[PDB]
Design a protein around this ligand. Structure first.
Ligand SMILES: CCCc1sc(-c2ccc(OC)c(OCC(C)(C)O)c2)nc1CSc1cc(N)nc(N)n1
Ligand SMILES: CCCc1sc(-c2ccc(OC)c(OCC(C)(C)O)c2)nc1CSc1cc(N)nc(N)n1
Ligand SMILES: CCCc1sc(-c2ccc(OC)c(OCC(C)(C)O)c2)nc1CSc1cc(N)nc(N)n1
Ligand SMILES: CCCc1sc(-c2ccc(OC)c(OCC(C)(C)O)c2)nc1CSc1cc(N)nc(N)n1
Ligand SMILES: O=c1ccn([C@@H]2O[C@H](COP(=O)(O)OP(=O)(O)O)[C@@H](O)[C@H]2O)c(=O)[nH]1
Ligand SMILES: O=c1ccn([C@@H]2O[C@H](COP(=O)(O)OP(=O)(O)O)[C@@H](O)[C@H]2O)c(=O)[nH]1
Lengths: 230, 231
């Protein structure tokens, strides 16, 4: 199986793009993001719901707890697909809706930066993150990234389009701060991670500013070519 | 795998470190993994450890969950590493753990849940992580046996009074009964059902360590060497 993580800002179009891909090839399957599932039943998802709501109310009390549980749920859920899926397929591809690196170098790092996590919580999380991925998540190494690039302003409208109730307060500032970090890591590539192979990973950046729900062929053609390059 | 893994279990100040330390010297084939939190009680672990301990003491309701996660992680890292580091050329290698991932959760984390310093979402979340993660290690850290060092709260208090740490001097006798009770259920009556199936069939040796054993441990070790020859 090849592993491709699909990255991008909130409401840039990842769920939608990934649900277009999985429909196109028996060799293509998807791992959605747990935090995504949490946003509306097994024990993980009641913890997910409670913990999500707690995070909305008092993020500086709950950011450490949330981050450690979101990533754990992602690490476990990517494994459920990599060890039990695409058994009878010729050129398997598993497409991750975000990654263990999104968890750390976008969201957790941004919470540390808005002081939702104190120094020690952040230092426990990075050590907890290094070890949890290296003990259990080795097989998760990514063969490439797809960055669905959407201006901060495109994203603000798309949460409006998504018309979810709890997400209309999101200031362009919050959405802009995630954008800058997304730009630094994947486009300008000025971010340093603690993972050496992430320095070299193939990366495909896709301008997803124009809507693509019924005009996505050119985007899908780029993915096919990018995949061949692996 | 060929290394025997034995937990030493006991309440605070029962004398586990004293025992462990005695044991390491009685044989070149006998090795010990000190409990990471006891050390905190200077790497980045000491730094992080140092802080969350003081934060934990300062406010149990805020830091209990964070502390419990890091203590159990730092423990697993000592344990899996000693496996790799010592006893590669021993014909009769035994590794003594100062406590286990079971005491983390079944003594300490449960206690803190029962005392409302972790809410339900933190305790089930903590339990989720412990369950799944120890189940990745199919048999690796899993115990060959357990040695219960059974003392009284008073001895432990008495022994707290002797250990000479003001930072502990205020630990209340009432907390010990609670902790002591949790040990007796798990290690004496065997009524603590857990979610690690092999445990209920892990042999337990119980030693009463109320009598001062420091100059006079030979009996205690005979019972340990007797126990090891049946595992
Ligand atoms: C529903 C998505 C999860 C949430 S909720 C949230 C949030 C909610 C309320 C907040 O204050 C009122 C908030 O403020 C953050 C801040 C005040 C800047 O520290 C963040 N940020 C986030 C982004 S954190 C996140 C998201 C995600 N998908 N994965 C990971 N690992 N972390
Ligand atoms: C992926 C980011 C989700 C975020 S981030 C966020 C947020 C971040 C920073 C903020 O100020 C710095 C913020 O303030 C919103 C406010 C201006 C107070 O209305 C909200 N709100 C949200 C919506 S919180 C939420 C609640 C909920 N129940 N479900 C979901 N999925 N999300
Ligand atoms: C960081 C100091 C260690 C502390 S502090 C502590 C504690 C401190 C103050 C408390 O109330 C003000 C407290 O609440 C008493 C209780 C009845 C649990 O609410 C617990 N319990 C503990 C033992 S936590 C522990 C020890 C250990 N060796 N291993 C693990 N996994 N956890
Ligand atoms: C492994 C420590 C275990 C415990 S448990 C404890 C404690 C727990 C609960 C308590 O009340 C419920 C407690 O007493 C606080 C009180 C007496 C009410 O002010 C102390 N303190 C401690 C140790 S605090 C400590 C210990 C230590 N070795 N070093 C430092 N710097 N701090
Ligand atoms: O080109 C697009 C991409 C997305 N969407 C919609 O915009 C919202 C946000 O997109 P999505 O959930 O895919 O973003 P994600 O958070 O998954 O990146 C959803 O209601 C989608 O149906 C759209 O109308 N056109
Ligand atoms: O036979 C003994 C065993 C222990 N102790 C004392 O009791 C205290 C607690 O011992 P230890 O640190 O070994 O307890 P642990 O927390 O490790 O069980 C220490 O001051 C020991 O010196 C003692 O006087 N005699």
């Amino acid at each position: 199986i090849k592993k491709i993580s699909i990255e991008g800002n909130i409401a840039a179009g990842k769920s939608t793009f990934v649900n277009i891909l999985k429909q196109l090839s028996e060799d293509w399957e998807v791992v959605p993001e747990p935090v995504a599932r949490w946003s509306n039943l097994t024990m993980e998802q009641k913890n997910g719901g409670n913990v999500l709501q707690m995070m909305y109310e008092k993020p500086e009390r709950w950011s450490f707890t949330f981050q450690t549980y979101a990533c754990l749920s992602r690490i476990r859920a990517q494994l459920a697909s990599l060890n039990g899926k695409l058994k009878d397929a010729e050129k398997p591809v598993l497409f991750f809706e975000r990654s263990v690196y999104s968890d750390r170098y976008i969201f957790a790092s941004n919470l540390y930066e808005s002081e939702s996590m104190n120094e020690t919580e952040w230092t426990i999380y990075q050590d907890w993150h290094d070890w949890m991925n290296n003990q259990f998540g080795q097989s998760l190494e990514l063969d490439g990234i797809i960055y669905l690039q959407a201006t901060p302003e495109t994203c603000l409208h798309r949460i409006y389009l998504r018309g979810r109730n709890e997400e209309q307060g999101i200031p362009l500032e919050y959405l802009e701060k995630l954008h800058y970090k997304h730009e630094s890591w994947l486009l300008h590539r000025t971010l340093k991670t603690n993972f050496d192979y992430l320095q070299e990973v193939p990366i495909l950046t896709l301008d997803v500013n124009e809507d693509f729900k019924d005009k996505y062929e050119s985007l899908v053609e780029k993915v096919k070519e990018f995949l061949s390059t692996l």
